[PDB]
Design a protein around this ligand. Structure first.
Ligand SMILES: [Zn+2]
Ligand SMILES: [Zn+2]
Ligand SMILES: [Zn+2]
Length: 148
RNA sequence: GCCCUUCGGGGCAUUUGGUCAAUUUGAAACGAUACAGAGAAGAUUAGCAUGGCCCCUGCACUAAGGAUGACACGCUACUCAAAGAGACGCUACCAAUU
């Protein structure tokens, strides 16, 4: 379970976890530092942006470690997705076509916008104004479209 | 970026949003202090209401309480006369002790 077991109850992870544990702990400590970041000098949605950034990065590490540069077994990959080292739904969207670089699921959630739209970060920057710096309110993405 | 191609081309995906993170000048309120100071025609007071540009506590916007919760207590011509009886009214002002 992803609930914390005592120690004697703890089952070992699969093989290769000793090989990837250092990068996984790098992402975990990055996430704790994002928890401890100050919020006085920035706005509030901007305070929540780094969690989405680090979650995307951790899931991308797992995703391209399994699919692109094959370095982990399928047992280990399924274990990582089950135990919370990567976002299975974000990885599913990365497998979809036209969503190969999606920042977050909240940015394609169309039931939650005013006019049932995706966010502006999903729009190909070829159709936007020049020097129109987008940083979306949801995660601060500057451009996710696969063409971008 | 990926995919397809008859290598000319075509496809997949499509417009977020919370006035800034900044406290003097776009609106918080007690308490302390100062002061005064509790209804019903003598004195003392159980209350229940009434009306709303007065509200408070309460789930009660179909209880109850808040001094009977308070407020009430100033002010005061205006649909408006008639009868009969008066008026040096409406003008003048005036000549003997012995
Ligand atoms: Zn996003
Ligand atoms: Zn976005
Ligand atoms: Zn994005």
């Amino acid at each position: 379970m992803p609930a914390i077991r005592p120690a004697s109850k703890r089952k070992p992870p699969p093989d290769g976890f000793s090989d990837i544990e250092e990068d996984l702990l790098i992402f975990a400590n990055k996430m704790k530092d994002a928890q401890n970041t100050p919020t006085d000098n920035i706005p509030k949605h901007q305070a929540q942006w780094p969690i989405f950034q680090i979650a995307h990065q951790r899931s991308r590490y797992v995703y391209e470690l399994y699919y692109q540069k094959q370095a982990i077994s399928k047992q280990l990959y399924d274990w990582l997705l089950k135990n919370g080292y990567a976002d299975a739904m974000l990885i599913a969207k990365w497998k979809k076509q036209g969503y190969e670089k999606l920042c977050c699921l909240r940015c394609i959630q169309t039931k939650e916008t005013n006019f049932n739209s995706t966010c502006i970060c999903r729009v190909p920057r070829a159709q936007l104004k020049e020097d129109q710096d987008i940083q979306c309110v949801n995660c601060g993405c500057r451009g996710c479209a696969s063409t971008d």
